[PDB]
Design a protein around this ligand. Structure first.
Ligand SMILES: CC(C)c1ccccc1NC(=O)Nc1ccc(S(N)(=O)=O)cc1
Ligand SMILES: [Zn+2]
Length: 258
């Protein structure tokens, strides 16, 4: 039927509806830390979220998105590998049914418990819908999660999940500050890739931070209480909503650090 993460509609099936699944710049990928090369030409990364304005949180049946008002020039990502300015539109996570899996990118084949994606669009293309049609349309900032100490800045997200348990439910979610989800270091790897779910468009500059954030077991357990299904349908837990690593093909991963 329609795509998902199950046996009959998961990642190995996506290529039938979305042939670009077998394309030349698909994501995620395994980051081989020894083959990644330091690029002194990379300019410093600039994350300016002081004026970010969150509006709403939505369970879309695949993950949950915290959405931002992107009608003004507020929360922007620039520098690093990027030319120009990219505006924050939403963030979401991918996670596992177990602490030992959940991330989409891997690091020397290591899977983290989850992965946060902060999605930004290139303002030269006017809006998100036009930007995703361009090879440099999006920049996604990826941040690994490991299970250990709690992330206090995540808790406001965790506590609203009960109100969006099932597909299609949304809730007001204003004044959430995504700066509370960032690690200390902005050291990163970068490569050209794609959306990691259908339609799998090859429009993303990936920027994946080397330093993970820690969240508590209790925090990620609450992610795993969400549902893929809609209300009044059979309960299917929203877990393992990650795509495995795709072939690197003719790409090089660059590091911002040595
Ligand atoms: C046509 C698609 C791109 C579209 C138009 C309007 C609203 C939402 C969407 N879909 C998405 O935004 N999908 C989407 C966004 C981000 C990602 S990810 N996991 O690579 O960061 C994967 C899928
Ligand atoms: Zn994602």
């Amino acid at each position: 039927h329609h795509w998902g993460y199950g046996k009959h509609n998961g990642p190995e099936h996506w290529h039938k509806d979305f042939p670009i699944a077998k394309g030349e710049r698909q994501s995620p990928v395994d980051i081989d830390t020894h083959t990644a090369k330091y690029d002194p030409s990379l300019k410093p990364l600039s994350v300016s979220y002081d004026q970010a304005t969150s509006l709403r949180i939505l369970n879309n049946g695949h993950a949950f998105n915290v959405e931002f008002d992107d009608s003004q020039d507020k929360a922007v990502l620039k520098g690093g590998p990027l030319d120009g300015t990219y505006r924050l539109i939403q963030f979401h996570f991918h996670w596992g049914s177990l602490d030992g899996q959940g991330s989409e990118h891997t690091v020397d084949k290591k899977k983290y418990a989850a992965e946060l994606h902060l999605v930004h669009w290139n303002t030269k293309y006017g809006d998100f819908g036009k930007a995703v049609q361009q090879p440099d349309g999006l920049a996604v900032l990826g941040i690994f999660l490991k299970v250990g100490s709690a992330k206090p800045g995540l808790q406001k997200v965790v506590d609203v999940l009960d109100s969006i348990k099932t597909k299609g439910k949304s809730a007001d979610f204003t004044n959430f500050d995504p700066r509370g989800l960032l690690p200390e270091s902005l050291d990163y790897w970068t490569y050209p890739g794609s959306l990691t779910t259908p339609p799998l468009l090859e429009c993303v500059t990936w920027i994946v931070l080397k330093e993970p954030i820690s969240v508590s077991s209790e925090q990620v357990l609450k992610f795993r209480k969400l549902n893929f299904n809609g209300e009044g349908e059979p309960e299917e837990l929203m877990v393992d909503n990650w795509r495995p690593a795709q072939p690197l093909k003719n790409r090089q991963i660059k590091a911002s650090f040595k």
